[PDB]
Amino acid sequence: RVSNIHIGYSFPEWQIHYSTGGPVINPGSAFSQAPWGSTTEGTRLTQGASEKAIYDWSHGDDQPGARETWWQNNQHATGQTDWAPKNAHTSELNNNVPAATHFWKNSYHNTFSPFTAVDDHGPQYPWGAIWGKYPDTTHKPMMSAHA
Amino acid sequence: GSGVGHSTGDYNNRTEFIYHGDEVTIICHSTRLVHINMSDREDYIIYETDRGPLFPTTQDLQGRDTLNDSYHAKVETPWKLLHANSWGCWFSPADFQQMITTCRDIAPIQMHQKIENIVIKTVSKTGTGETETTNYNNDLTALLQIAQDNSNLLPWAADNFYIDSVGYVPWRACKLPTYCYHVDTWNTIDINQADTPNQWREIKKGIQWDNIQFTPLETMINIDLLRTGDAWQSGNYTFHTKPTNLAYHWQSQRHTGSCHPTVAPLVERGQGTNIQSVNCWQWGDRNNPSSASTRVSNIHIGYSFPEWQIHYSTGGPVINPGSAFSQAPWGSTTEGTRLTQGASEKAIYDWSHGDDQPGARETWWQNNQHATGQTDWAPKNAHTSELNNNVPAATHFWKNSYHNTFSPFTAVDDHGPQYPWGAIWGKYPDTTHKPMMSAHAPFLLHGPPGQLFVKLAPNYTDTLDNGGITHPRIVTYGTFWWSGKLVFKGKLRTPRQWNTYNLPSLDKRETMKNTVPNEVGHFELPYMPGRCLPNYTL
Amino acid sequence: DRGPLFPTTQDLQGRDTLNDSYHAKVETPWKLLHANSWGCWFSPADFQQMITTCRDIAPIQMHQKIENIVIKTVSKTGTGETETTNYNNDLTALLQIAQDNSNLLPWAADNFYIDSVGYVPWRACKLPTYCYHVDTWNTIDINQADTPNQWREIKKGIQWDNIQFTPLETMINIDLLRTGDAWQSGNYTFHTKPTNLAYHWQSQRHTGSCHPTVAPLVERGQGTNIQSVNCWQWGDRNNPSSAST
Amino acid sequence: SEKAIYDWSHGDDQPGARETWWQNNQHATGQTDWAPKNAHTSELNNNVPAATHFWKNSYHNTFSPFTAVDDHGPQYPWGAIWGKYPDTTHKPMMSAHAPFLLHGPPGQLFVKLAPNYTDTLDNGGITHPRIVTYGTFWWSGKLVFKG
Amino acid sequence: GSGVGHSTGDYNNRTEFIYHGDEVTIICHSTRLVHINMSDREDYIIYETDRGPLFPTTQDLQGRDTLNDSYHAKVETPWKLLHANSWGCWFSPADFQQMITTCRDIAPIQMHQKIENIVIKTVSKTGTGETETTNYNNDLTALLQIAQDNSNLLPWAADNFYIDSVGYVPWRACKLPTYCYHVDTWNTIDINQADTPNQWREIKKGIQWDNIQFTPLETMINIDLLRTGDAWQSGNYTFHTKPTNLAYHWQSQRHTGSCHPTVAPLVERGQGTNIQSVNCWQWGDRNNPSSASTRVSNIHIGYSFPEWQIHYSTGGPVINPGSAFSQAPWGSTTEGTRLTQGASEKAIYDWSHGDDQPGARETWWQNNQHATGQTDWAPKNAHTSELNNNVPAATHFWKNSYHNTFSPFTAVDDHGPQYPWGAIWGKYPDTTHKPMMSAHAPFLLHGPPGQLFVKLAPNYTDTLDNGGITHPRIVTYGTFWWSGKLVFKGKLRTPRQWNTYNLPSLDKRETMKNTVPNEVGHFELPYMPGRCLPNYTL
């Protein structure tokens, strides 16, 4: 049914950009893999632009001389979850059900469009950065991937 | 005076066009009689739904059939929702033609609305058997209760996406849809599986109860109780938005800018020749040939998108729309082969909304046929590795791909207003990134016009026991008169060309006699696009 | 016509169809004069002066003039071999000038064909003729269901029903000038943003805090990345914690 | 990358021929992202991906809300200084050639010689000869920049 | 400054639409380049003319062929006449569409005009044989002489009935017709004779010399001599007239008033039945049946006239027009059988006026096809002696008569404006009884806009002898730029109906591509009627 906007967008993930400085990750949008069966214990699905913090005794860690890891799947954001292997597209949208041909299951594409409403990570305690810096470029980013 | 026997309002449904230099002010009046009856229950309820019709129970279509899922979970309220959001509510067919002929762009300015001439009465069946007699007699002391939600505390259900609104025809009575809104539920269908391909399976299905949000209207907003002699005023509402363009754009990326230098033809019906060697900016490392196909440009008009993109979300599968464009250049026609590819859309509507006969639903499929400059259809595009004087090889050329070419350079354009059935306005989501443009309603609002809820207060019998088991109530219905005024402003249109235009008419699929009433009074409102006249983009 | 090097055959199976210049225009008797280009306003040393000494720049205001108008006619009396031509003034003759301020006419001065006033100040210049596109469908199908590795044209031609034809005479006021009078543009003020005159060399791995390392002890020695550090990593990954992720 | 084709009237050495200058944009190395060289993998964790779950050769559009990017900038001699926005609901975010996009661009200036007819113009349309005429005028302009 | 090398004017040809509430102000600018050359002679002359082509020299068609007489007698003057009277002069096709779409009625308000940028030059042929060379070189001292006739002392020749006016296309050069006017002559042809029937004979033919009136312009009005550096102003002219209605009327005498009482149909596609016994005013002594055919009415719409009425006058045979109406209800069609009966008219026009190709003349026959309410065609009417409950006998009924039913009761309606070629205004005759309405031009004026005369002063050689035999003069021609501004005012039109209109377009006989220029630049202006939209009369 028609709608004015779309919530979320697929992105090739994890996108490895080989740049002039070296390979990097190009992030996708933040979302929870919980609707798809992800859990901290058991099978972990990293797909949601999840991130891990590595920290030591000086920053919020229990014992000296070791580093502790906290992996945050962003588990409360379930409305934004769009994961490209699960999406499909068909050629014609009508009263007929598509054929085996004219249906494409497995593609990875970037659906970010003028219609997409999306949402960022937000503040992460303790370890998240509060602020960040814009680059000076003709096109500034629309939103931040961490801070 | 005021009381039982004095009328609280009058009937005004008519439009006004105020012309001053380079400015048009349209004042739309709409008055409708609304037939309301007692709620199915006095309680809020929350329930899951079935999948829907034509959802697969088997693997035989191997998942391609799962687009049919309507499954969801809602909280249904005793309240009814009354909104005017649609074009056919405010305009008659001749008023909308007047607007789209004489105006360049338009925006809504301010709005207010009223409810008055409230009548409530009860049904008493004394028939006691065959040849049964019913009596309809007033309850002078009885309450219609009205709640306007100004601060938008309640979830937004009035988007006109189910075309449930006040009627289009002024002299007919109307009925309101029941208000209800979604609750959090996971619906995740896996059509692509590692172990077992060509299968579909549901991973997580059900209501998520832990964080569920349940909001009654009683706790959120003040409710006004009205009797037969008093009336209700909305107050003024002011839109904050941008005008929408009433002209369609025919120019593609090769219809804009300076055209390639040519040698004019000497005779009649002769064609010019492109000069081979010219000064040009070319893309890539290419001088030969320097052609209009490859030359630099500041912008690009249109973008490809995977279409139709089926997004399997936490709530279920959805369509992720592409840009609106006409498939006519590729041979699409309403009759014959239909190409749905342009982000086309169909309206389903009934006798209450612009339909000819009662008891049936009519369908209007709009291919957006005037927008031919924006048309970009991914199977037809290609890409090559090197752009130079050489023609690419079989390798280094990719024909069939589906990609999203939306970039910083793309200039694109929306659907625009659709008469009768299109929504006038819509609501932004609150997210860090707001959408750049709307896929249906021409105007997205941060605060949209407040939602207006209407309900009949219950009339109990004498047997209410406080225990909960027996709370009968006497059958009751009511009617009230809804008035509203919406003001638009726009820019006056003047001829930019020598030759005559094609002024907005009736789509070839419609004829004039089906627009006017019948021997029995049946007629349907015609379709008109909000953009019926061409103009230059750049 | 299509243009040079457009395929007439299927031998290159559609890959050759990028060469299409086909279009449809309305050509006007008017000539177009614009200064839009960098080489018009700056000399090579002036542009070097600017890009050396400035961070960013934007245009502010502009005006222009036309004057010292001379019009004359050609008279060939030669009547055969050893032909003589005479160039003599018409004192009463008109140059007509139209400035389009409200942008009612289609926009043809983009400098994409590099047709502009000359770059060299001491040389004479000639203007391109003004013309603009009309609505036409050109749709080539290089990807077909029935017959692959083919190309076919679906819709080709001018769309006459809604066509727009705008003369300058009806849209804008035209000024007629004789040899003694001159023409002024009036002032024009740009509204825009500055553009940055510095290029950026930093990639996504040249920005931000660099990975912690152990500095080299000797000359031409290279530092070593510390294996275990505090970091924010993408995904569920501590090992290795690298500048890549 | 883009190439300019220009003649003696515009910055060219010899008359009667056209010269070509291909500009690879060679100073902008930080922005370089070339799709055949990028890759994406399914899971990002301490494990190295398998042969499956790694996709080398794809071509996708990674433009996202997070991307900071940068345009061509001014090109001497031949680059356009300004350009025109299209009127559409979504205006482009940045220009692919001219450094400055304008809503109203500088007005277009049109020039024509009025016709000088002979005495034989017949009003019928068949014969309207006109005497061969040419002209010269001097164009002056002043453009002000600030930076 | 001013002199040889300074231009005296600028080119403005464009229209402006000023909208204020219920009022429209249209300001039309028109500027044209006029090519003028030396007069055929510097003297006035007076001469008779031949009959014309296809006039009978024999009795074989027994007089029916004598309608072809063009015979007359004129006084031809060296002056040329320049008038803007026509619709196609002031409006472009899109401007006229804008007007007739958005306005109810309109009238011209004020007008002024100019002449400037005067160039005069001479032709010198030195070729002296084959391969001849001509030189075109300025005479800086030479005179264009201009005479505006404000008081209307000269006979009125600018009626645009020969469609000789300033050109319709702004970018093309124009040429003026020579001014000349009739002198008194008797032409009387007798097609009905007592002695010898089925013959034709001329009684009195020739110029009547005794009372003849000969008026030069030199004696009547002041003449302005202009050189290349000076320019000419008209002064302001103000029209005094009434607006003309831009809506056509479809209602006949049986489409007006209260309709006969009927019983509505119960089903779909059923038709109602007229109630047999009703209260009515009937004509005559008649109650049975009381039918919509016979019932009283205050007025009558339309009148029959003998048509085509050929009036044999003292000047020759003429057509006496009937009222304008459509023959479409009777089965007339442009293709197929054409019925000319409605006071229809044809325009003959050339490349200079709205025609596609040079060297040929194109014809447009306008049946007035939107006016169907006024249609009264005498062969179809009948009359009977008694009007009562009895049906008339074979006697007392007259079928085939041709009579003029114009009466005090008749309401009738004129042609209205015809684009491009119709005259805007006309001139009243001075007679004791002025006509009630016009047969062509929408506006009849007492003082019409003054006639403007233009002439090149003669350039003699040195051989002028004062004896009259030798007065050679050097071949000279000129060009000047004519500017004018005509202001119109009218009433804004608003929708009176629910359903959409048919907005003014292009006649089925025209297509859009013939309106726009060609590969070689050939195009023709489309026909539009000034009344393209319906409205209720009474």
Residue numbers in the entry:
A (entry chain P): 326 to 472
B (entry chain D), E (entry chain M): 32 to 569
C (entry chain N): 81 to 325
D (entry chain N): 375 to 521
Question: Can you list sentences taken from the study reporting this PDB entry?
Answer:
The capsid also protects the genome enroute to the nucleus for uncoating and replication. This study determines the capsid structures of TuV and CuV using cryo-electron microscopy and image reconstruction (cryo-EM) at ~2.9 Å resolution and compares them to the recently determined structure of BuV and other protoparvoviruses toward functional annotation. The VP ORF encodes two overlapping structural proteins, VP1 and VP2, sixty copies of which assemble the T = 1 icosahedral capsid in an approximate 1:10 ratio, respectively. The individual VPs contain an eight-stranded (βB to βI) anti-parallel β-barrel motif, with the βBIDG sheet forming the interior surface of the capsid. The virus capsid plays a central role in the infection by the protoparvoviruses as it mediates the attachment of the virus to specific receptors on target cells.
In 2016, CuV was found in human fecal samples and cutaneous T-cell lymphomas (CTCL). In the CuV capsid, the depression at the 2-fold (blue to cyan colors, corresponding to a distance of <110 Å from the center of the capsid) is broad, continuous, and has a slight diagonal tilt relative to the icosahedral 2-fold axes. While CuV’s VR1 is extended compared to MVMp due to a five amino acid insertion, VR3 is one amino acid shorter and adopts a different conformation. The absence of this loop separates the 3-fold protrusions in the CuV capsid while the loop merges the 3-fold protrusions in MVMp as well as protoparvoviruses CPV, FPV, PPV, H1-PV, and LuIII, which all share this loop. In contrast to TuV, the two highest signals showed glycans with α2-6-linked SIA in a 6’SLN (N-acetylneuraminic acid-α2-6-galactose-β1-4-N-acetyl- glucosamine) context. In contrast, CuV possesses a lysine in the same position (K377), which is similar to the CPV variant (R377K) unable to bind SIA. Thus, while TuV might bind SIA in a similar way to MVM or CPV, CuV’s SIA binding is likely different due to sequence and structural variability in the capsid’s surface loops.
